[PDB]
Amino acid sequence: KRFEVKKWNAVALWAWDIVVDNCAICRNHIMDLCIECQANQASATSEECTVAWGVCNHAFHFHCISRWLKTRQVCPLDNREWEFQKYGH
Template sequence: MKVTILSYNSVAAWKWDTSTEPHKLCDYATNGDTDDYDDDDDECGICRLAYESCCPACKIPGDDCPLIWGECKHVFHMHCLLKWIDTESSKQQCPLDRRPWGKVDDWCFDCLR
């Protein structure tokens, strides 16, 4: 019996790897070593939605909803964190550990392209 495939639809899935420290993303992208990473922490600490979904501030599903890493190594949806920081009660602190908020600046996006 001969089978001929007339057409096919490919499917892809992706996931934020928040267990990787931002300055190590270049090494991770080039080596592809995923053995040392744990998938337990995959939701925003503010809105409690998965990183793959958009945050409540995004008006249209599928809107660009980037993540932001703090110096304390906590990760949030950028929109959730900006809304949190704008509140007076936040005192410019991380919502999870109350350390002064500072985002990680040493990104290396060129190696991820």
């Protein structure tokens, strides 16, 4: 051949049990509102209700884990203190 690849340096990202089909706290979906929102509108009044990203690479609706931080702390799918390394998908 005329051009042959010798080296490569991809960077491979990884995800924990974010369950893109079901938030593990309320069980609705990674997106598509939560149990404490249901209707898209439901008097949105600014604020938000997107997705929260932990340091342990777990994902839930921002409110679900904020309400879970009033019941416990260590992210439910492990034993690591839940952090907020992101906001939104």
